[PDB]
Amino acid sequence: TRLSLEAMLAERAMVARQDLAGLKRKLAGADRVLAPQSPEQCGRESAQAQARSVTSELKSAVKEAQGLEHQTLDFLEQLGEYPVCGILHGDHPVHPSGTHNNNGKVSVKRQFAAGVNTSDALTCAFRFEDSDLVRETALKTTYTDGTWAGFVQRLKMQTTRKCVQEKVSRKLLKQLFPYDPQKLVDVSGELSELVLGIKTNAIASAGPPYWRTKRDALPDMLDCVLPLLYDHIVRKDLTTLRNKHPELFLAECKNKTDRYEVESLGEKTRPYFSHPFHLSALVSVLSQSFSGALKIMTEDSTSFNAYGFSWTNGGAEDLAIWARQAGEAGKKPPRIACYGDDTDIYYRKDGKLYRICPDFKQMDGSVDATTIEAVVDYVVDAHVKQYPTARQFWEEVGKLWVEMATQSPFLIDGTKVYRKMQKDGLMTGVVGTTLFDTVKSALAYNDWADQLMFGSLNLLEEKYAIEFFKNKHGLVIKEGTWKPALVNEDPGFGELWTEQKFLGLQLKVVRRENEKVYVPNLPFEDWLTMWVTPRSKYRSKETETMRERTLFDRARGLLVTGAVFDERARGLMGAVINSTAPEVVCMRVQEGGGRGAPPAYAFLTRDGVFEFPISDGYPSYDWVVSLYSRDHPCDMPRVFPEAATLIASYRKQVMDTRVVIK
Amino acid sequence: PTRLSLEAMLAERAMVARQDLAGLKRKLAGADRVLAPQSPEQCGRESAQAQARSVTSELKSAVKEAQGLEHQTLDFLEQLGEYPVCGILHGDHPVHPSGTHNNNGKVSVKRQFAAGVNTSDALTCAFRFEDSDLVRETALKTTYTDGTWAGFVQRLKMQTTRKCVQEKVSRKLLKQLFPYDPQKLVDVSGELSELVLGIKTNAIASAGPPYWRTKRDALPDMLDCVLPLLYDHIVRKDLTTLRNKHPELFLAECKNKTDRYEVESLGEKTRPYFSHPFHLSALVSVLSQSFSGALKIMTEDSTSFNAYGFSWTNGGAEDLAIWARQAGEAGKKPPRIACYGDDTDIYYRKDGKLYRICPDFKQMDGSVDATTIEAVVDYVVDAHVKQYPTARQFWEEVGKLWVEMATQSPFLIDGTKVYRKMQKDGLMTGVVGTTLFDTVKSALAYNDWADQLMFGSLNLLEEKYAIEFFKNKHGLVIKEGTWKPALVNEDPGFGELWTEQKFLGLQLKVVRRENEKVYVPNLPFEDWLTMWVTPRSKYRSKETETMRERTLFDRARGLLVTGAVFDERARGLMGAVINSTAPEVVCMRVQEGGGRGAPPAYAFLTRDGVFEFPISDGYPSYDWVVSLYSRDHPCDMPRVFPEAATLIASYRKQVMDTRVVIKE
Ligand SMILES: Nc1ncnc2c1ncn2[C@@H]1O[C@H](COP(=O)(O)OP(=O)(O)OP(=O)(O)O)[C@@H](O)[C@H]1O
Ligand SMILES: [Mg+2]
C-alpha cells in the first residue's frame, strides 16, 4: 500500500480515465481540436423522431415479409433424427443438460426476429444531412435476420445447382496460387500446440455438440472431444464415432443476420453453416497456415490470388501497378484478381486499359466437388512436402475437410437432420470458404484468359461471357456486371481509377504535398448507407454512455476506410466525432486493446486487425493518407491535444534545487 | 475481443474463471489439497460465536466506559488564536474542500473516539480451535481501539512537557554512531519536481492541512499547485509572507493513534501523533529516505549503533547474533549496543558470560531534546550538501523547516483552536524522522553509558543505577523492571532460544534444516494469539462475507512467515485457519501487491520494506519459511492445490503427435 509519488500519479491517471463523472469536470473546460464538420439540418427532437419513423416502417416491412411461407425442403436428403450426445467432461456433458434438444434428439430454434438496428446511428444522420435524402438511403438497406421465404429459397440456390467439375492439375494450382513453402508451419509438430496457435472468433458458435460460445466451449473441445476425435483418426475408426456419437459430425445451416436490401428479402437471405468446434479447429490448422504462406497479385505476377490483399501501406497503389502491366487482349496475358467471389480483371483493347469488376450469383453454390477436393489436396500436399512425417495423418484430416465442405449432415429447424443430395455445391461457412470461392473463380478466369489467346475476343462481351462461364465452368455472372470501364491508369488529384468497386471500394488518387496517394473511396450514399445500417442489433441493456462511444468508434473506422476522401461523408462523421462528449473520447475503453474499436472492413491490413494508436485520437485527413502511403503513419492527432496533463491534473512545473536565495 | 488465438482464449478463461468463485467452487470443489498442521478444534459455529460476541461486547462496554471520562485541560499547550482557511484554489476547486472542516469562518477539526472496536471473526477462529477460557482472557487484556481522552491528553501532556537534557553531539561523533555510505545518497541536486516523485509514502494516509483528504486525493493539488507556491516562497527567503496569508499550510493535526492498547491503562494511555501537511511532509522526506537508505546498521559496520535498516530475513537473524557475540568484558573492551528508535538491544559480558539487556523507555518521544533534533537535521542535511553541495543553501532552508515540523509546528486537536508546544524539547511524534530522531537520542545516551563502563563504573549494569543515569543525564526514562541482563545461549540448540528477551517485538530462536541450524524469529503462543485476536482493522462496514475469509487467510499466512510456524502451538492455530478456509478463496484472484496475496503485518522482515509471497494460493510450509531466514534460496512456495492450474482452465495437455502412422 506504500507507493512512490510517481506511482500514485500513474495510479490516479489510469483510474481517473474510468471516472466519467469526474472526467467531464476536468475535460468539459478544455481546448478541443475539431474535425471538418457538416453543420447541424434540424433540431434534436426532429432528427431522434424521424429515425423512429424510418425504423418502424423498416420493421413493419420486415415483419410483413417475415409472414411469407417458406418453400418445402424436398431438395435435401434427410438422415432422419440425430440423437443427443453423449460425452461428458467431468462435471457436465458437452451438450448441456438443458440447452436445446427435443428429449432424445437434437434440435434448434430459428431466429427471424425483427428488427431494431439502433436508432442513434441513423439519428446522427438526420441531424446533419437532408431529411429527404437520409430517409431514402435509410429505406434502401436494412440489417436483419431475414425471412423464412428468402432463407430457404437462397438455400435451395446453393443446393440444387448444376456445377462443372473443373479440370485442375496440381501443377496448375502451383501456377495460379503460388506460395512460399517456408511460411507454412511445421505440421509435424504435436497436435495440441498446433491447434492452440489457431486464430478464430471467441464469441461465435462452437457448433455441435457444445451449443455454446467457442470460449465457453473451448475446454470441452480441447481436452475432451479433440483427443476422442484424434484417437479415432489414428486407426480410421471415425465410422465408429460417427455412429455412437453422430452429433460430433453434425452442422447447423443458419441465416446470416446481415445488411440486406429491403425489397429483396422475400427472396435473398444468405445461409451459412457452422461445423463442430473440434472439426472447425483441427481443419483450421492447414487453412490458416497455407493462407499465410499464400502470395498475392502484387508479389507474384503469375498469381490470380487476392486472398491476402490489403489497401494500406502502398497496397492500394500496388493494385494499380499490377493492373497496368496487363496486356492487349489476344496477344499478351491479362491481369486478373480473385478474392473469393469478388474479382478485378484488367485487359487492354487497342492499347487502352479496361477494367471489369463482375459478380457471380450465389457463387458458393457453383463450386464443384473436384475443385474442393483438389484444393484440399493441394493444401494438405503442400504441407506434407516440406513437413512430410505426418503424411498420412493430415490426409485423414484433409479427407474430413472435404466432407465438411460437401457432404456434412446439418440441422435447419427442429429435430430433422438434412444433407445436400449432391457432392457438388459448397457448404458456406465451412473452414476455407474463402479459398474455395477463390480457386473456383480463378480457374474460371484462367480458362477464360486462355480462351482469349485463341482469338476469341468475343468473350470480352457480357452476352457471350455469361454463356461461356455457365456451360463450361458452371459459374454464373450477374446480369449487368460485365461492363468494361476505361480506366485513367494515371489519374490526377481527386481523380478515380474507375467507377467500379473491388472489395466493395472504388480506388482514388489524392494529394500528399506534391506526391499523389492511391486511396479507397466511395460515393456518399455508400458511406451513408453503411453508417445508417450498423451490423449490431440493439443491446437494450447497453448504456447511454457506450453507444455515444460506439458511434465515435464507427465514425473513426469509416474515415480510415475512406470516408475522409469523400467530402459529404467526411463532414457527417466529423460532425459525429465533434458531437461526441469529452468524457466519451478519453475514457479508457475496452477493445483491442484499449485503443478504441477497430474498423469493421477487414482488408486494411494483412491481419484484418487494424488498430488505432490511441483511444482519444481522431483520424485527420493527412493522417489517413499517411496510412495508405508507403511511408510512416503520421501522428494520430488527439481530440484533446494535451489531455494527459489534465487527467493526471499535474502540469510539470520544473523547479531546480540550485537557486541562490535572497 | 473477437478474433484471437486459442492459445490466448485459454488465457482469457483462466484469468477470468479465477474471478468466478461460483465456478472455483465447482472446479476447486473436490480437488487435491495440501494440509497444514492443525490444532484439534474445540468449538465452532454458535458454540464459538457467542464466545466471541460476549468478548466483543465486554471489550467495548469497558472501552465505552473508559472512553467516558474527564480530560485534564490543555493548559500545558500554548494557544495561537485561530487559523484561517485556504484560500488557495486549483481550477474548479480549492485545496480545502467546501464541506469538510471547518465549522465556520476558520479551520476546525473533529477528533473522534468510536466504540468502536475490532471484528470478532478473527477472534471466532481462536475460540473455534484453541482453549476457550484462555482465549476468553487473552482477548480481554488487549484491544485495538481509538483510545480514551484522558489517555490521549495525559500522554500528550507527558511528551510535550518533559524536562529533557540537551546532548553533547559533535557532528563527527554522529559519523561514528551513525556511519552512512556517502555515495548511495540521492543526488539531491537534480531538480526538485522530479526528486519529490521518487518518495515512498502511504497512499491512503491523510495528507494533512489544508487538504483534509487521503494522499491519493490530494497528490495533484499539492505538486503543481502548493509545492511551487512553497518553493517560490522559499527561494526568495520570504517564507514569512506565506505565514500570514495561508497559515494552514504550516498547520499540523494532533490525532490519537488507533492501535493495540492494553485495557487497564486505557484511561491513562493513548498515543498522540501529528499529521503534517503533505507538501511539508513530502519535501522533507527527500532527505530522510535518501539517508535512511544510505545508512549503515549492526551487521555491516561494527562501530555503528544504528538498527534503522535491520531485517531478520536472509541471515539477518543470525547476522544479529554474530555481531552480538563479540561484545567485550564490561569495563575493559567495547560492548555491543543496538538502537532501533525506542527499541534497544544491549550486549555485554560479565566474567566471560554473555549478557543481554532489552529495556524500554517511557514516552521516549517526549524525552528527545532540541539540540539532538537540531544536530540530526544538520547531520542529514550536510551529508547531502557535501557529496552534492551544488544545492547547499536550498536544502539547508528545508532543514530549518524540518526542525520546525518536528518541534513547534502549530497543531489542532479538537474543535477550532490551534495549539502549539510550549517548549522546544520533546519530539513531535508522527513527523518524518521520528524513527531516526528516536534512534539518535537512544544511541547518544547509550554511547555515554558505554563510555562510563570504561571508568570502572560497572554499577550502571544494574537497573536501579541505570535508571538514574538515563533520567538525570539524558532525561531518558526507563520503564520499571525492564533492565534485566539475561545470560545468553551464545550457540543455541535446535529449538532453543537465544534469550527469552524481546528485540523488535520478536525473540531469537534456532531451528533445524537437514544438517545446519538456522536462526529465526519467534514468539510464545500468548503473543501470537494476541497478534491474531487483535487485528489492526475495525470492521469496515460494507466489506463482504467472502473478503474476510481471504483476510483471515492472508493474515494467518502472514504471521507464519513472521515466525508463527516456529512455535508449535501457534503453527497449529494458523494451519487450522488455512485448512478450514474455502478452496476457491485460496486460489481466487486476490487484490494485494501485486496479485500475490496480502503482505504480513511485520515491517522488518526485509527492509527494503516490502516482503510479498511468490503466489496467491501458496501455503507457508515450515520448510519454506526457514528458506527465507536462511542465507539460501527461497524455496518454491507450496501450493495448497497443486493441480489447480489445470483444474481452473479445465485443460490438461494431452500429447497427440502427428508423425504416427495410420493403420487399423
Ligand atoms: N510488530 C512490530 N512492528 C514494527 N515495530 C515493532 C513491532 N514490535 C516492536 N516494534 C518496535 O519495538 C518498539 C517497542 O516499544 P513499545 O512501543 O512497546 O514501547 P512503549 O512501552 O509502548 O512506549 P510508550 O511509553 O511510548 O508507550 C516499537 O517502538 C517498535 O519500533
Ligand atoms: Mg479531481
Author numbering:
A (entry chain A): 11 to 672
B (entry chain B): 10 to 673
Provide text from the study.
In this report, we describe the structural and functional characterization of the RdRP domain of the permutotetravirus Thosea asigna virus (TaV), an insect virus which infects larvae of Setothosea asigna (Lepidoptera), the major defoliating pest of oil and coconut palms in Southeast Asia. Additionally, in vitro polymerization assays show that the TaV enzyme is active in a primer-independent reaction, thus confirming the existence of a functional relationship with flaviviral RdRPs.
TaVpol-ssRNA-rNTP complex co-crystals were obtained after incubation of TaVpol with the oligonucleotide template 5’-CCCAUUCGACUCCUG, ATP, CTP and MnCl2. This complex crystallized in the space group I222 with one TaVpol dimer in the asymmetric unit. The structure was solved by Molecular Replacement and refined to 3.5 Å resolution. Structural comparisons between unbound and ssRNA-rNTP-bound enzymes revealed two significant conformational changes: (i) a ∼7˚ rotation of one monomer with respect to the other in the dimer; and (ii) a conformational rearrangement of the polymerase N-terminus, resulting in a subtle opening of the central cavity that facilitates template entry. The structural analysis of this complex revealed the presence of an extra density at the polymerase active site in one of the two molecules of the crystal asymmetric unit (Molecule B). However, strong peaks were detected along the template channel of the polymerase that would correspond to the phosphate moieties of the oligonucleotide bound in a similar orientation to that of templates derived from the superimposition of available RdRP-ssRNA complexes onto the TaV enzyme. The phosphate molecules, visible in the TaVpol-ssRNA-ATP complex co-crystals, associate with the fingers domain in the template channel, likely representing the template strand being directed to the catalytic site.
